[PDB]
């Protein structure tokens, strides 16, 4: 809840929200437009009967309900796929050891196995690698 | 090109091929860039020199 940034005396209707769209919204698609929403039959290039503005003001005026307060909502979209990572958390930089059975956590990919220098042909955009049956087989060293 | 869930993709491969026209021999297509645009796209035109 954000009552100290979206509320002020005598009301505050700065925000907006849409209810009138020609179709349903596909995921992560913005439809920002002030095109007058004419359902009607006539063109209605302007406002008026049965041809109204597509977005209304949320009317976030101070407090008029616990379920009607000004909630600030932010969504975080991660992509947990096999691709070169950009964001992490705390990092330890233990030196790589080969020809030995080690637990590895390479760029979020955790597992146990033995590592060794290989003679594969990773293209500069290839990161994870695999074998015949869809399992991580060879991970190229991101440093060296 | 494609823009599924954004992420405009450009795959490229250059070869001074025989040069007659659109050829027949197969060729892989390596990616160059991968940029998460996150916008809406519907048409396609091109600039010239």
């Amino acid at each position: 809840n954000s009552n100290k940034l979206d509320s002020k005396h005598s009301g505050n209707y700065d925000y907006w929200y849409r209810l009138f769209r020609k179709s349903k919204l596909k995921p992560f698609e913005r439809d920002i437009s002030t095109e007058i929403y004419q359902a009607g039959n006539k063109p209605c290039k302007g406002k008026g009967p049965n041809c109204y503005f597509p977005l209304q003001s949320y009317g976030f005026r101070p407090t008029y309900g616990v379920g009607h307060q000004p909630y600030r909502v932010v969504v975080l979209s991660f992509e947990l796929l096999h691709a070169p990572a950009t964001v992490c958390g705390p990092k330890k930089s233990t030196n790589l050891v080969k020809n030995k059975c080690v637990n590895f956590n390479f760029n979020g990919l955790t597992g146990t196995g033995v590592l060794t220098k290989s003679n594969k042909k990773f293209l500069p955009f290839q990161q994870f690698g695999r074998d015949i049956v869809d399992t991580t087989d060879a991970v190229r060293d991101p440093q060296t | 090109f494609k823009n599924i869930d954004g992420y405009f993709k450009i795959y490229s491969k250059h070869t001074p091929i025989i040069g007659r026209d659109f050829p027949q021999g197969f060729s892989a297509l390596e990616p160059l860039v991968d940029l998460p645009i996150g916008i809406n796209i519907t048409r396609f035109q091109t600039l010239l020199a």
Binding site: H82, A83, P84 | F26, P31
Partner: peptide
Amino acid sequence: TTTQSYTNSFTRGVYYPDKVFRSS
């Protein structure tokens, strides 16, 4: 002004779907 000739695509247009190495 440009022409609008139609041709057959033959076999073409296959890229690497992901960043995962494979062989055989």
